[PDB]
Amino acid sequence: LNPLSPDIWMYVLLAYLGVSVVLFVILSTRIVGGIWWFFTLIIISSYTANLAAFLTVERMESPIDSADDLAKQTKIEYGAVEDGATMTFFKKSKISTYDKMWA
């Protein structure tokens, strides 16, 4: 379930079976072996880099366990009951966590 767009690995699969059968029907052997080893290493490195970026983005977004962690977080929206309790305290709070939560 990669964040990258799919079917590129399907293209690699069909092209790999094609170059495998055109190798099977026939100094060039070590050349095409090193070429395919290098290009599969390139594909593995790109997949590893994309997985590392997605895992770093997931582990950067920690679960919300505190008010200041919620204040630094921006995707989850938050609110309370207007014109009464738990709003007038947020109206006149000078602490930076609660100021950024009034923001």
């Binding site: 990258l4 767009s5 590129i8 293209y11 690699v12 092209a15 170059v19 055109v22 026939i26 100094l27 060039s28 050349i31 095409v32 070429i35 395919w36 290009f39 390139i42 594909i43 790109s46 994309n50």
Partner: peptide, 23 residues
């Protein structure tokens, strides 16, 4: 990820032409 696919199929056509020339 389709940026990798373009250079991948350019190098695939290059190795196909290398197989065609060397044989």
């Amino acid at each position: 990820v389709q940026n990798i696919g373009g250079i991948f199929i350019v190098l695939a056509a290059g190795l196909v032409l290398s197989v065609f020339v060397a044989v």
